[PDB]
Design a protein around this ligand. Structure first.
Ligand SMILES: Nc1nc2c(ccn2[C@@H]2O[C@H](COP(=O)(O)OP(=O)(O)OP(=O)(O)O)[C@@H](O)[C@H]2O)c(=O)[nH]1
Ligand SMILES: Nc1nc2c(ccn2[C@@H]2O[C@H](COP(=O)(O)OP(=O)(O)OP(=O)(O)O)[C@@H](O)[C@H]2O)c(=O)[nH]1
Ligand SMILES: Nc1nc2c(ccn2[C@@H]2O[C@H](COP(=O)(O)OP(=O)(O)OP(=O)(O)O)[C@@H](O)[C@H]2O)c(=O)[nH]1
Ligand SMILES: Nc1nc2c(ccn2[C@@H]2O[C@H](COP(=O)(O)OP(=O)(O)OP(=O)(O)O)[C@@H](O)[C@H]2O)c(=O)[nH]1
Ligand SMILES: Nc1nc2c(ccn2[C@@H]2O[C@H](COP(=O)(O)OP(=O)(O)OP(=O)(O)O)[C@@H](O)[C@H]2O)c(=O)[nH]1
Ligand SMILES: Nc1nc2c(ccn2[C@@H]2O[C@H](COP(=O)(O)OP(=O)(O)OP(=O)(O)O)[C@@H](O)[C@H]2O)c(=O)[nH]1
Ligand SMILES: Nc1nc2c(ccn2[C@@H]2O[C@H](COP(=O)(O)OP(=O)(O)OP(=O)(O)O)[C@@H](O)[C@H]2O)c(=O)[nH]1
Ligand SMILES: N[C@@H](Cc1ccccc1)C(=O)O
Ligand SMILES: N[C@@H](Cc1ccccc1)C(=O)O
Ligand SMILES: N[C@@H](Cc1ccccc1)C(=O)O
Ligand SMILES: N[C@@H](Cc1ccccc1)C(=O)O
Ligand SMILES: N[C@@H](Cc1ccccc1)C(=O)O
Ligand SMILES: [Zn+2]
Ligand SMILES: [Zn+2]
Ligand SMILES: [Zn+2]
Ligand SMILES: [Zn+2]
Ligand SMILES: [Zn+2]
Ligand SMILES: [Zn+2]
Ligand SMILES: [Zn+2]
Lengths: 83, 187, 84, 84, 83, 84, 190, 192, 192, 190, 189, 190
């Protein structure tokens, strides 16, 4: 039911992080997400080139609703829930 | 390979002496093709090394996670575009993940990549990637500061110019607080 | 015990995730597969899991918890949950 | 007095937890077991408890308060509660 | 005028509390006991009260306002209210 | 297009307020009186208004949007709105 | 062009000879005989940046390295001419950028400084032009430029503030948007 | 803990080993300059490892004072001399210590005495750095402790890699010095 | 507070104690270089502890101006000479003070005179640092005060641990200097 | 000559390409494609002193003055090439002289450093050639030349003494005969 | 020379005098922070004047060996002014020209410790170090330079915070031959 | 002279002595951090005394070329071992000489420092050996050698004078007889 999405530095432009190693593969495919591991990181991530506003509209069509939005460092995070 | 290629390098250096208008038979130049060839092989001795041999199993357990830095490591490299030295210092920092590298090995890793025909950016990245793969730490930061003789002795001739390159991996990229502690401690 | 505080540091896609304090529900900590530790110099014990926070949030929904708020503070991302 | 502001610094799992200002409800401050103090150089009094914020949030729910928002600011984690 | 933004700096237990901008409702500013000022070098006027934010929130509830969100940004703690 | 992101920097009482990106609804941008620009070195266009964010929020309510969340990140104050 | 330089050299020398007479000096004395020509050539050299284009200066020195890390060329000696008084302003330029898969040749950053500094200028314009030229040539994630200079018009004359220095800064792309990238750049140029 | 009686008993064994080293290096232990070396080298080595003879309790010597003091205390530029355990060659430098008291304040000199207990041993920089921080944490129970050690390892300058300017910097941040970046930043600013 | 009459009355008792110290060290109080030493050492010790003769109110001398300045004021590099209460040996260095006035601005020199009241006593660095900050806070009621003291303790260099380069840095941050890290950062940047 | 440079450039490039292969490198990789030509041009620039003569360098910049006082041009940046290893040696040259009737143009003292330093050299010879060129061109009462240099052959290899510096000194005419003149020179170049 | 038995017998007298000084200054010797001060101040004063317990012969130990300049410079020195009983601290730079006897390097610093750890005047201290080396080694010459900050001139009295006293003693060839003295002064910079 | 065969034959004896030292100090030679220490300490000690394996003739390697100038190689990093305590003494060596028809290869002056410093020594002997070796190899008009070193035996133990430095000087030939030559040398090594 829970989803975490994020963007860095500016909210108007991507990349947008949309998942982790254990994310729903069908949802990642639906968003057009690619999988990568940044150098030195102990984890894989899914990302899209789209700005977060576009990702939020796509997720609403999948039954997700934004519960909370927060800034942490230079990262803007949205916590969504499939209600 | 070094023994076999030494006469070919000396023949090329002797040819360079003639092509510059010099006399390779003059006292001061007689041994120059051989000495220049040996110096060039020493400057590129990093191609003879592998990370595994250089590390020599000097990886030890350190349960407490503290920042480790080896700074002011003298570095001497060769510009691949002009075959002229670029020299300076390397500052390395890392946050261990239960494994700590032997202090000297951080300088030996600098020697593997610096003693090659290079570009500062590639050199900086290679040092950080080698430490990351050998130790699997939480993160690594590498800062290289160098004077490229191609920018001071010729070309633009900017006497005081210095190139600074930085590579931050793992927590050194993701956590600005870790990167700031590293940059503060290398001053 | 209606309120719960969970957190992660540096990146949201990977653990550890802090899931409790000394007075947390021991059954809930055991259910999450949490370990107890005291970081050096700290005056308190904490419970943590290796799972990324998204996994912990899904497990907590199955226990009756709902996210009320999410916030960043320093390099820590915090969720405040409530058993409603 | 429908609104309440509570906060903690540096870590969410341990107190002190700030639970009031000079004009806070004295009965509520007594119920929480709060003490009053003035940090040196400050132009105001504050009420605080030794309990971690999760304990304070549970006590406040039993008094009719609900968390409306939680936010980080600097090294302070703040909760805004409302009596509803 | 359904939305309101209020804020405080450095500590939440003490004022001043910023309660408006140049285009704020003058009657609401008068009701809160707000004063108008322009900090040196600023291109805008602001309304403020000496009261801590908890007191301002209670006064605004009596005027039909409810807190929708609270956030920190730099050393400023902001509340977004709606009626 | 149900979601909207708006923002302001440094002070909340004064504009400019960022109200869109390249793929924003052009009619909504025209309605707000927004201008389009690309800051030097940026890989994207943005829409902005001279109005302070409180004015933009009131105008957006008259277009069916409600504030779902408000957050600070760096020196930027962001509102996430939803057409409901 | 170099043809413009040859054609304008006598006009510049005539103007410098006229300046020598108008100052009360004797253009015929030994020490001043060649001065109209030498001053004219020096002024042409100080303004040689007008003869250059970014394309020629770059000379295709754009490489492909999988670099997504900070690159800085600092302490680049800079010599410019104040456009208000025709007196030098000299100092250092520190440049930083975050590549976007195109990496520029190190020396080309100093050559870009030479195009704009060898002109009649103002520090603010010079600083901005260097940053914009790198941005347009490489399309990087961001560029930061810091120029520190002593203006001789503020030390040899006018206000005569011997220690005064002007520092100008231009931050584009991620160097403006991300304070962490700007802070790393400012820390590394010390 | 090593005793002064242990030192007297082991001194002839250390001198015999140093005399053997002189012969194995090709030197003449009978020449004037080397006659007393087996004994002088043995005594120097016992002094370099005198930290094994000490306890935290004896070193503290009850120099813990009470105070309504909740402000940062730093003792910086403490000269440190240690022995690398891998090569038995010195590593030398400075130790900078900071702490935030919790009603108990350590005697200023004791912070340098704690550096002496651990540095006068066969060590590794990382272990030395955590031992100083842990000793202060356990003795005072403060809000936090920060320790920075900067050292020149002679094994990296006189031999091996031979990097003349190389320096090792190790840092340990406990309690509020780890949890609160503002406390750590004040500490790092004040030790410059 | 100690008076000038107390000083005159106690001077012979101090001189008798210093003469006794000369004899107890094995020295000859009758030799030319030591004849006046009991009196000079007694006068020097009274001067080193002259801060006991002063009060904040007299020192301030009504040098409080009502200019509404809402900007940072710093007096840095104030030479400080104090006396360690535990060993009666000097500790010397510098004091750096910063404050954000509210409605009252203190006279520049009074910040250095406040350093003199507390430093010219038998002290401990921590207490001295806090006393300077509390005196400024109570005298002006500002938005906040920051005080940094850096000192060399002769008890750690001439004796004891004998760490020649060691320095103690103490910090006290009150009001907005504690609550707002941005104010504290501006202060620490400006005192470098 | 510049014609010699154009004719020999392909031969130098062929030798540098051969060096790349003999070192185990790939001359076809992107970073090395133009290296034979760039290295050849850099080496010709490092040895451009062979294209110059003292007479052309002086350019008749010898003035007649009633100056019989000490003239020094110090901290002249110098970049030379060791003739034994073909590796740079770099540093500073400090020149002093006591004019008799002729005073040399200030910049020509640095140009004289350039004629001899831009060659395959040994520091001692370089030092002597600068002093002798000034002595023969001006016939002064005396000349003093001090060259301080870091040899990269002693730093990057061989003995690898990172801080080592070679200082050579030539004192001619009154700079040798009168210790008071040499002491004034050495005090003024600090 | 002062002995360890003399130290045990005189340590209570020093402590009693410091307790009396605490009372005469207006302080309370019974307050927590001052309880141990009479003993600590006494021990510190014995340590500052431990040089009276030492002789040149004991210090010379096994450190004399059987014609080039030898210098030990930047020797940290901590002494006590005999006029005010307040420290004067700085550096000592020693140079000598051997005559068939060379001294152990460390002993030059130990010689500084014998005379500096006493109640002194800079001039006497400087001369005593030069004379001790001259008599122990019989060299061609000795040069001694002392640079010190006197706390009696900076914490009180004239209060000249930058003032420094420099004293010099040149014996044998260091006095007779200006070329030897000039080489010494150049090499100690 | 010591050889690599003597080194390999004596390595187990050195390791046995270092293992014995570990036990006699109260340490555990079986703990992880000390397991290879007897061998690593033994190898380090034979590297610190590698000077016994060398001779002046081999080190010079015929690098003697066929001047009227002072030649100086200063700031040569020096690492030696005190023979009395077997503890390092480290610093710098500054060498100057006036050639007499024979000039020595620059690096050999640093190689001569290596022969004598890599031994159990006393500073005075080391200083004199360097000056005598140059004197005998070149037969110059004179040689001057200045060694400045921190003895760890005076800082880490004993007197514990943190800032103490030993400076030793040897002046031979004209460097002793002519004060003007010695003064030029001392001025140029600053
Ligand atoms: N990023 C990077 N770039 C590097 C090196 C080393 C060298 N280079 C750069 O290659 C470019 C080659 O250009 P080019 O073909 O035009 O040559 P040439 O006419 O001789 O140039 P110039 O010297 O300006 O006269 C130069 O820009 C040089 O700086 C490095 O480490 N990192
Ligand atoms: N922002 C900017 N300004 C620049 C330069 C270069 C120069 N200038 C400034 O032009 C102004 C001209 O004023 P003016 O007409 O009154 O001249 P004049 O009486 O001679 O002045 P003064 O010098 O005071 O005697 C001066 O203020 C000068 O500083 C630059 O790089 N950036
Ligand atoms: N982390 C840490 N590491 C430390 C010390 C002290 C020493 N060491 C390191 O032990 C490693 C041993 O490796 P090894 O067996 O291959 O030895 P050896 O061939 O002689 O090496 P080298 O010196 O390269 O010639 C080296 O890397 C050395 O630096 C410390 O404090 N912290
Ligand atoms: N916090 C604080 N501590 C201070 C001072 C002034 C002094 N002190 C410290 O009192 C302690 C007394 O201990 P003690 O009884 O064991 O004495 P003693 O054997 O002579 O010690 P030592 O010097 O090690 O030989 C010492 O640690 C000393 O440093 C200060 O300003 N702040
Ligand atoms: N006087 C003088 N000497 C000069 C130069 C330039 C270089 N040289 C010196 O010729 C010598 C050649 O010796 P060699 O054959 O043994 O070579 P090689 O094994 O590579 O040596 P090394 O470096 O020790 O490894 C070296 O000593 C070198 O320093 C100069 O300007 N002045
Ligand atoms: N030559 C020499 N002189 C020395 C010392 C140590 C101290 N002194 C000097 O004895 C004088 C004492 O004078 P007095 O009686 O008048 O005392 P008092 O009023 O307290 O003086 P003051 O300090 O001026 O206030 C002072 O001049 C002081 O400097 C030394 O090493 N060498
Ligand atoms: N001239 C000269 N002297 C040298 C060295 C190297 C060392 N030495 C000196 O031999 C002396 C031996 O004396 P000793 O037996 O009493 O030793 P020990 O009790 O351990 O001494 P200490 O250090 O005081 O504790 C010391 O004085 C030492 O400094 C050198 O290069 N030149
Ligand atoms: N490291 C992120 C902040 C962050 C913390 C926790 C979770 C997610 C993000 C940044 O500096 O932008
Ligand atoms: N100390 C945390 C911030 C924090 C404050 C308060 C509560 C929880 C977390 C950090 O720097 O990441
Ligand atoms: N001063 C707080 C932040 C804060 C600002 C405004 C209100 C409340 C708290 C901190 O640095 O942690
Ligand atoms: N400038 C504010 C932060 C802020 C940004 C945007 C809007 C409002 C406030 C601070 O530093 O506290
Ligand atoms: N770059 C913004 C923060 C931000 C991050 C992510 C998204 C939006 C804004 C600032 O420094 O103010
Ligand atoms: Zn190049
Ligand atoms: Zn101008
Ligand atoms: Zn080692
Ligand atoms: Zn003390
Ligand atoms: Zn060479
Ligand atoms: Zn005195
Ligand atoms: Zn020794």
């Amino acid at each position: 039911p829970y989803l975490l999405i994020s963007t860095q530095i500016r909210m108007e432009v991507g990349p947008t992080m949309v998942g982790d190693e254990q994310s729903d593969p069908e949802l990642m495919q639906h968003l057009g997400a690619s999988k990568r591991r940044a150098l030195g990181n102990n984890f894989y991530e899914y990302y899209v080139d789209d700005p977060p506003r576009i990702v939020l509209d796509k997720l609403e069509r999948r039954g997700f609703r934004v519960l909370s939005m927060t800034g942490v460092g230079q990262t803007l995070v949205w916590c969504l829930h499939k209600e | 390979d070094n023994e076999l290629n030494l006469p070919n390098l000396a023949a090329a250096y002797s040819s360079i002496l003639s092509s510059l208008g010099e006399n390779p038979q003059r006292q001061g130049l007689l041994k120059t093709p051989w000495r220049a060839a040996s110096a060039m092989q020493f400057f590129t001795k990093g191609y003879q090394e592998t990370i595994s041999d250089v590390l020599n199993d000097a990886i030890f357990d350190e349960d407490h996670d503290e920042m480790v830095i080896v700074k002011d490591i003298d570095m001497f490299s060769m510009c691949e575009h002009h075959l002229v030295p670029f020299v300076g210092k390397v500052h390395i920092g890392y946050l261990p993940n239960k494994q700590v590298l032997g202090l000297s090995k951080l300088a030996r890793i600098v020697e593997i990549y610096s003693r090659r025909l290079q570009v500062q950016e590639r050199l900086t990245k290679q040092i950080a990637v080698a430490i990351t793969e050998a130790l699997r730490p939480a993160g690594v930061g590498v800062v290289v500061e160098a004077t490229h003789m191609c920018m001071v002795m010729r070309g633009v001739q900017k006497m005081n110019s210095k190139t600074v390159t930085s590579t931050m991996l793992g927590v050194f990229r993701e956590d600005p607080k870790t990167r700031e502690e590293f940059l503060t401690l290398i001053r």
